[PDB]
Design a binder for this molecule. Structure first.
Ligand code: FAD
Length: 636
């Protein structure tokens, strides 16, 4: 009940956060009874909002719907409601305001970028009564939430998955926007380059081996401190190669030991056969041989030698048996055959997809630093088209499209943002504001010849973080057919590449859209390179793979096709951040920190500024809410 609202808000139900201790020092330093009352007021307020997030939750309503003991204490209820509303925990997203916004606005903020982070922060600042203007370079909102819509076909070229609802703010948004979320079936048969499926035994064996290898790299990093080598940071790819080499060495060693067991037994057989030949000489000589006493003696001796031979013949058979078993029970010659390595490279490509970067670039120590904060519940696709979310957030906002920022000026007095119209470069716009919120992607901030100049130039710590962090890349190919020729009960199926270098080329296909749309993925080293290929050629290669899997006659020519090129997109310059070898979690926090030339003037939000939820739409959303709170605290 009330316990669940705190979980849905990413908070502990029986504890107080660092932030709450800072804002409510009287309660933390006071008696624990007041703390329990505080926590119930907070949890109950969150439950009221989450039960019905389509309408603003007012202080008055909170008092009206509160329990009898706690509705008496109104000052505490107000303090709690104000705290939650400011930080974007109870009144965020699209909601029906019960009271219109005041005509008088108390501050001027220019927000660069109209992605989820920008739109969320703008909606919050508007909610708080500030004058907000968004500058967006594209001819559309959403940024890295891009939805292709033509005829009946709807497909996401950017963000496409809600990674669980338990604790996800996107849950609330989904109720506000009426997102059509659909579960993804966890079933992905693999098909080799020839088009024949990977049998279950091999699929399962390789997958088990992939998981074992990855856990091994984790052990090296954390237990053995294998993190710095020859004054260079260890990449995940490095560690994977180290682990693979150790396993290959174990195979060679076991094979060698078995070889030696066989040679020793073979040597024993050779020695025994020589011994037997000698005994046959002896027996054949004694056979050639009181005289009746002599006969009795010779026959006695001959039977003794013959029984002596019998013992050795039994032992001959027994050593022959041991040798035969060893000849028929060897260990594997190689750890991974060619086909084994290709299937394993498919799994590596899936990892490169998840992190939108080649594994040789991921920090071994920190590439999965955010795994502790992952959300509960089945992962979901957006059937309505993820663009439905930003478009809903944009309603009622002062958004200037086709306006590309080229300079940001910030001083102790105020700020200037200079922008150019992309449609006609000749006309230029100047916007004077109190504060600037930058949600420019990390790729755009990384641009060596800068697209946006800062006056004064950004400080050393900020620029160093921007250099250190990784900004990955990942691409999609949308194929729209008239009929479904694939298996509807599999949302995913893989294509195993021929080379380790190209393992990430069209390695994955989604058939998750209930309409006849197929989505082919380009991860790792292939992502950057294949942007330089024409769309007809990429689609021909996709068709070739699908023909190989289903029959050349079974796949028609597609009716519609679309290719994303996110690294070339000048407004993205990649897909989303990843934790590069040089970088760590603290760099994300550094991105989030604002700049002061006094009070702070330049603020930062976006996918690359939230430690615990990077590379995600919900992370963008939460960063937007966080910076809205920060700016409202500063200017109100
Ligand atoms: C292929 C792909 C798939 C993804 N899949 C998922 C997924 O399944 N789940 C998930 O959670 N996340 C996913 N993401 C990541 C997700 O899209 C981001 O985490 C999120 O959209 C970040 O939003 P943002 O506003 O911070 O950045 P953006 O969306 O990039 O917003 C920045 C905005 O600034 C604009 N801009 C850029 N330069 C300028 C300029 N000079 N002047 C003015 N405006 C400018 C851009 O046009 C853009 O609108 C995916 C990303 C990619 C590339």
């Amino acid at each position: 009940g009330v316990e669940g609202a705190a979980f849905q808000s990413r908070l502990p139900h029986d504890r107080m956060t660092s932030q709450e201790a800072a804002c409510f020092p009287d309660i933390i330093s006071g008696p624990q009874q007041t703390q329990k009352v505080f926590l119930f007021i907070r949890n109950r307020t969150l439950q009221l909002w989450l039960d019905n997030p389509k309408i603003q939750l007012t202080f008055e309503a909170t008092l009206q719907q509160l329990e009898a003991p706690y509705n008496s204490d109104t000052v505490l209820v107000h303090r709690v409601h104000s705290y939650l509303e400011r930080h974007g925990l109870i009144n965020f997203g699209i909601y029906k305001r019960i009271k219109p916004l005041p005509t008088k606005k108390t501050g001027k903020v220019i927000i660069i970028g109209s992605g989820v982070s920008g739109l969320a922060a703008a909606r919050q600042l508007q909610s708080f009564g500030m004058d907000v203007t968004l500058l967006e370079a594209r001819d559309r909102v959403g940024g890295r939430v891009a939805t292709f819509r033509k005829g009946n076909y709807v497909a996401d070229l950017g963000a496409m998955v809600v990674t669980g609802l338990g604790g996800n703010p996107m849950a609330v948004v989904s109720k506000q926007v009426n997102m059509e979320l659909a579960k993804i079936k966890q079933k992905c048969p693999l098909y080799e380059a020839n088009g024949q499926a990977v049998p279950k035994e091999k699929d399962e064996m390789v997958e088990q081996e992939f998981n074992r290898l990855l856990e091994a790299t984790s052990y090296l990093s954390h237990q053995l401190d294998f993190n710095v080598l020859n004054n260079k940071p260890v990449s995940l790819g490095q560690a994977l190669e180290v682990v693979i080499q150790l396993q290959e060495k174990h195979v060679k060693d076991e094979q060698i030991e078995h070889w030696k067991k066989i040679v020793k037994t073979q040597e024993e057989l050779k020695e025994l056969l020589n011994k037997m030949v000698n005994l046959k000489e002896k027996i054949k000589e004694l056979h050639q041989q009181t005289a009746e006493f002599l006969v009795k003696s010779k026959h006695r001796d001959l039977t003794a030698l013959c029984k002596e031979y019998d013992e050795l013949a039994e032992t001959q058979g027994k050593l022959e048996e041991k040798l035969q078993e060893l000849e028929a029970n060897p260990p594997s010659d190689v750890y991974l055959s060619s086909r084994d390595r290709q299937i394993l490279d498919w799994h590596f490509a899936n990892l490169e997809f998840a992190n939108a970067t080649p594994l040789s670039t991921l920090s071994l120590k920190h590439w999965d630093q955010d795994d502790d904060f992952e959300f509960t519940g089945s992962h979901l696709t957006v059937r309505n088209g993820y663009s439905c979310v930003p478009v809903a957030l944009a309603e009622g906002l002062d958004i200037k499209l086709n306006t590309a920022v080229r300079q940001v000026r910030y001083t102790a007095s105020g700020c200037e943002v200079i922008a150019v119209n992309t449609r006609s470069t000749s006309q230029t716009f100047i916007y004077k504001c109190d504060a600037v919120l930058c949600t420019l992607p990390l790729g755009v901030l990384k641009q060596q010849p800068p697209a946006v100049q800062f006056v004064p130039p950004l400080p050393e710590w900020k620029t160093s973080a921007v250099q250190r962090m990784g900004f990955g890349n990942l691409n999609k190919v949308v194929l729209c057919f008239d009929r479904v020729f694939w298996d509807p009960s599999v949302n995913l199926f893989g294509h195993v590449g021929s080379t380790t270098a190209s393992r990430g080329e069209l390695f994955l296909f989604w058939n998750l859209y209930k309409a006849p749309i197929l989505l082919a993925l380009v991860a790792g080293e292939a992502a950057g390179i294949m942007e330089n290929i024409s769309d007809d050629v990429i689609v021909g290669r996709c068709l070739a793979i699908l023909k190989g899997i289903f029959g050349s006659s079974a796949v028609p020519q597609p009716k519609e096709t679309v290719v994303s090129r996110w690294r070339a997109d000048p407004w993205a310059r990649g897909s989303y951040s990843y934790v590069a070898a040089g970088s760590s979690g603290n760099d994300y926090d550094l991105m989030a920190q604002p700049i002061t030339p006094p009070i702070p003037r330049l603020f930062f939000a976006g996918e690359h500024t939230i430690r615990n939820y990077p590379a995600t739409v919900h992370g963008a959303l939460l960063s937007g809410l966080r910076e809205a709170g920060r700016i409202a605290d500063q200017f109100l």
